Amino acid sequence: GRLRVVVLGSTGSIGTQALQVIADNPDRFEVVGLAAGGAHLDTLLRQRAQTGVTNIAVADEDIPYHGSDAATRLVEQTEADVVLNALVGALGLRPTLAALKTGARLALANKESLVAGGSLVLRAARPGQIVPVDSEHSALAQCLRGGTPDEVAKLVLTASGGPFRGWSAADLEHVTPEQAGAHPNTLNSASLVNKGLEVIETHLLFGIPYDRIDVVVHPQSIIHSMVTFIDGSTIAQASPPDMKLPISLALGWPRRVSGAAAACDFHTASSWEFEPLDTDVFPAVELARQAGVAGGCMTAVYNAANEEAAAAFLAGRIGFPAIVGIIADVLHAADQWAVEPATVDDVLDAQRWARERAQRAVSGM
Amino acid sequence: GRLRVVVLGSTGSIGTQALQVIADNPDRFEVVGLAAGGAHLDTLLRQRAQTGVTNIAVADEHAAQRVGDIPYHGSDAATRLVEQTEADVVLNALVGALGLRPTLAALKTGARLALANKESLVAGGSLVLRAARPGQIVPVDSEHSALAQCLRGGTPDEVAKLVLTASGGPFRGWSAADLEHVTPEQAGAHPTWSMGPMNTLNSASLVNKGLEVIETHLLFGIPYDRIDVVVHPQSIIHSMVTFIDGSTIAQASPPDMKLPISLALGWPRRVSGAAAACDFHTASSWEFEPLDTDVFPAVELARQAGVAGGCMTAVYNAANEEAAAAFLAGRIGFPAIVGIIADVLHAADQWAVEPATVDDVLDAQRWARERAQRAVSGM
Ligand SMILES: O=C(c1ccccc1Nc1cccc(C(F)(F)F)c1)N(O)CC[C@@H](c1ccc(Cl)c(Cl)c1)P(=O)(O)O
């Protein structure tokens, strides 16, 4: 019994680390499909040559699946046990629903499909079929083996805090892309939107109310999240930052993969720091809670407004603090959007509306 | 689903705290028995009055002329209480030698054993393990309780390492030369007729960690070479397990014995509101440093004793008590405590055999003490 794995977004960081794990564990896994956004052409051909897999999709015109929904066609067609969806942003919602319709495990890295899809994605899924790839949700799943659902008091997500811990909003006005770790996932870390995306994700996957989902800043990124139980016990998960750990566990769930990552080393001194998030300077998480509480298409809106505002920062059209400022403005104008999505088109409509309202805000800021 | 609980050693700190948990949770727990040594009769008597529990035992032969009306009293009376009382959980918080036979009787009834008595595992470990079903024993101390919670994070073949944490004691960071002439008072030990000064000293010498390592091997069936100790001055994380994939799971809580007590009583179910949670609203730091094993050889020495097996950890602990008492009395220097344990272990080949009965554990302890007395007497 080898598990058959489709890797979507194979040429990115998650994708390539996923292939390394499969290659180290040929007894446990087998690659049977790949899909890539064509920008890293050279890597895909290398992966075809190395894995021998010809069953390949390319999202940008020997390839059996070329097009714009190339990855979606591949998923529907290929006999698989696990689909790893590491596609970035919006190009990943349709492949997620396709993946879930096949009945295969969805190892989800592309948290945007879930944040935007909301209930639409949940209705497609059976229990235990969506298995998170990010480190925080991997941690939580691990820690929740520490009890039953009614023993849970709080889920506690850790946030690196980005490069701007201690910065005031005034300090933030003069921030460039490279200081926020970008160039004209990493930006979302700097602005705390990633955490907001993760609060929503946490709610959708585990069923926990927003008011029992905390965020604490932990700059060493060694504790990946924690669970506090009703007795006052907290269970935490810890490891040096290395995506192959939660990638490995997502593919082999419920079984751990030996040697996937280096453990923490307690033979040299270290220090794990905690501090409260500055909610005045970084309100992305509170804003996510608002959108999640409103529900429906509002989380699609939260995310789409982000992608657009962030794109505007990365082109130099807006200042850094305006990214989360615009999400705020867009959300507060989105009273028509707390409706449950009936189809993909509804989600697609929410996103278009959010993009355009963001562009409008840009064209004033 | 009301669990019936027998609380042995009911008048010390663990017993008094267990009873408070039970009084706060009457729909989950029912006290059905109490026992305490005759030195603590008056307190035991108040507990009868307060709980309404008349099934009580004086666990030794003491206060004999005052135990008119008590249903069980005398040597091994706590054992008889345990044999004769229908219960779901026995909490054994008796101290020392007194704890062992009641542990064995508890396991024989089929009840869950919430175990606080160090003697049971350290000295009578093989007797105790032989008597138990898998999962029948649930530890009550912080560290082992942490470890039991953390092992929920995988199947047994996925466990790479268990990691006990340690405050490091008052002598954390001290060099060998600095510790040569420290006094009992500098270890933080001051005269009192209890195990308190001994407990404090064990924490300064790292013998306490040694014992916990032994206990870890017995409780969880993990080899001594996969049991680590790390220094963690804050004592917020109580222990961790590292799995074969590189993931570590840790348990963290402000120090409060009600937490592991509640868990040991209710296992596998948690008890709402037992203790305060960690608060992440104020900034904090959790630090780790390696144990200095050159200066603190007591931990590796406990592994040597554990690997030898049988009554060997009975020997380690009994030799400890003797040498430590001698340091307390000002008769030997601080480094000589672990030196004397090692000298006694080196002579103790005959005690590696598995004990057939409690009497063999007792013979091992008697041999160890006399051997340690001899060594003390010649410095
Ligand atoms: O699982 C992870 C993760 C954790 C530690 C380190 C890296 C992580 N993933 C990651 C980070 C950057 C880039 C990528 C990738 F390129 F997609 F692979 C993945 N996340 O979900 C990333 C959130 C966090 C994170 C942590 C550290 C850094 Cl350096 C970054 Cl950029 C993001 P946060 O929201 O700021 O806490």
φ, ψ for residue B165 (rounded to 5)? Answer: -95, 160
- Same domain, yes or no, for B254 and B363? no
Which residue from B278, B168, B159 is spatially nearest to A218, judged by alpha carbons?
A: B278
Nearest ligand 1 atom to alpha carbon A157: 36
Is residue A332 a known part of a binding site?
no
- Asked which of A90, A108, A134 is the last residue of a domain, the reply is A134
Structure token digits, residue A148: 């039953």
Would you say the CB of residue A195 lies under 6 angstroms from ligand 1?
Answer: yes
> Which DSSP letter does residue A353 get?
H
Expressed in angstroms and rounded, the spacing between residue B378 Cα and the centre of ligand 1 is: 63
Known binding residues of B are 11-14, 37, 117-119, 141-143, 167, 190, 196, 203, 208-209, 212
Residue of A145, A214, A236 lying closest to B252 (CB–CB): A236
Instruction: Give B145 to chain A, closest Cα distance, Å.
Output: 10
Same domain, B32 and B86: yes
Pocket test for ligand 1, best of A243, A247, A274 (most atoms within 8 A of CB): A243
Tokens of B7: 């609380």
Picking from B100, B63, B97, B102, the residue whose alpha carbon sits closest to that of residue B84 is B102
Element (H, E) at B58: strand B56-58
Q: Residue A352 sits in a domain of what CATH number?
A: 1.10.1740.10
**Cβ-Cβ contacts under 8 Å, A250 against chain B:** none
CATH number for the domain harbouring residue A32: 3.40.50.720
Closest CA to A309 of A298, A299, A322: A322
**Count helices and strands in chain B by DSSP H and E runs:** 15, 12
Reduced to 3 states (helix: H, G, I; strand: E, B; else coil), residue B53 is coil
Are the C-beta atoms of A245 and A239 separated by less than 8 Å? yes
Q: How far is CA A15 from the centre of its chain?
A: 13
B249 lies in the same domain as B122:
no
Do B146 and B288 fall within a single domain?
Answer: yes
Strands A29-36 and A56-58: parallel
Mark residue B289 as left, alpha or beta (left: phi above 0; alpha: psi -120 to 50; beta: remaining). beta
The reply to whether residue B263 touches residue A230, judged by beta carbons under 8 angstroms, is: no
Query: If DSSP codes are grouped into helix, strand and coil, which group holds residue A269?
Result: coil
Counted residue by residue, chain B has a size of 379
Alpha helices, H only, chain B: 13-24, 41-51, 77-84, 100-109, 118-122, 125-130, 142-150, 176-179, 196-205, 207-220, 258-266, 298-308, 312-328, 336-346, 358-377
| Closest by Cβ to B288, choosing from A143, A249, A270 | A270
Same-domain pairing of A121 and A165: no
For the record, the structure tokens of A81 come out as: 């046990």
Q: A220, exposed or middle or buried, with CB in 10 Å at 0-12, 13-18, 19+?
A: middle
Residue A232: which of B149, B158, B259 has the nearest Cβ? B259
Instruction: Let me know: does B164 contact B143? Beta carbons within 8 Å.
Output: yes
Pocket test for ligand 1, best of A112, A185, A224, A237 (most atoms within 8 A of CB): A185
Q: Which amino acid is at B94?
A: L
Stretch (H or E) spanning A57: strand A56-58
**Cβ pair B35, B94 in contact under 8 A:** yes
Q: Which technique was the structure solved with, according to the deposited record?
A: X-ray
**Are A117 and A143 found together in one domain?**
no
Rounded to the nearest angstrom, the distance between the alpha carbon of A220 and the centre of ligand 1 is 12
Task: Kindly tell me the burial class for residue B42, based on how many C-beta atoms sit within 10 Å of its own C-beta (0-12, 13-18, 19 or more).
Answer: exposed
What is the residue whose two structure tokens read 């997620």?
A: A96
Q: Which residue, among B198, B180, B175, B166, has the nearest Cα to B323 in the 3D structure?
A: B198
Q: Which of B292, B308, B340 is the last residue of a domain?
A: B292
Best residue among A87, A198, A221 to mutate for probing ligand 1, ranked by most atoms within 8 Å of CB: A221
Alpha carbon distance A101, B364 (integer Å) = 67
Q: What tokens appear for A274 in the block?
A: 């905690």
Verify that A155 and A201 share a domain, yes or no.
yes
Domain match, A261 and A142 both: yes
CA distances from B177 to B170, B262, B301 (A): 16, 43, 20
Q: What's phi and psi for A20, nearest 5 deg?
A: -60, -45
* Pairing mode, strands B3-8 and B29-36: parallel
Resolution in angstroms for this experimental structure? 2.2
Is A355 within 8 Å of A363 (Cβ atoms)? no
The span from the CA of A271 to the CA of A274, in Å, is 10
How many other C-beta atoms lie within 10 A of the C-beta of residue B302? 33
Q: Are residues B45 and B128 in the same domain?
A: yes
B84-112 CB burial, b ≥16 within 10 A, e <16: ebebbbbbbbbbeebbbbbbbbbbebebb
Quick one: A34 and A130 in the same domain?
yes
DSSP lists the bridge partners of residue B112 as: B89
Per DSSP, B151 falls in state G
Please give the residue range of the domain that contains residue B354.
293-379
Q: Is B368:B341 a contact under the CB 8 Å cutoff?
A: no
**A285, A235: one domain:** no
For β-strands B112-115 and B89-92, DSSP reports them as: parallel
- Distance (Å) from CA A185 to ligand 1 centroid: 7
Pick from B292, B311, B335: which residue ends a domain? B292
Nearest Cα to B324, choosing from B341, B312, B311?
B341
Instruction: Report the domain count for chain A.
Output: 3
**Which residue in this structure is represented by tokens 């069953």?**
A55
Q: Which residues of A82-118 are buried (b: 16+ CB within 10 A; e: fewer)?
A: bbbbbbeebbbbbbbbbbbebebbbbbbbbbbbbbbb
DSSP string covering A3-29, please? Answer: EEEEEESTTSHHHHHHHHHHHH-TTTE
Show residues of chain A in contact with B299, CB under 8 Å.
none
> By alpha-carbon position, which residue is closest to atom 7 of ligand 1?
A241
Question: Does residue B285 share a domain with residue B146?
Answer: yes
Nearest Cα to B89, choosing from B221, B1, B149?
B1
Residue of B nearest to A256 (CA): B245
Cα B336 to the center of its chain, rounded Å:
24
* B78 phi/psi in degrees, rounded to 5: -65, -35
CA–CA dist B302, A195 (Å, integer): 46
Select from B165, B154, B163, B164 the least CA-distant residue to B244: B154
CB B306 within 8 A of CB B211: no
Query: In 3-state terms, what secondary structure has residue A132?
Result: strand
Contact at CB, A248 and B245, closer than 8 angstroms: yes
Query: How many angstroms from the chain centroid is the CA of residue B319?
Result: 17
CA distances from residue A128 to A10, A54, A103 in whole angstroms, order as listed: 24, 30, 11
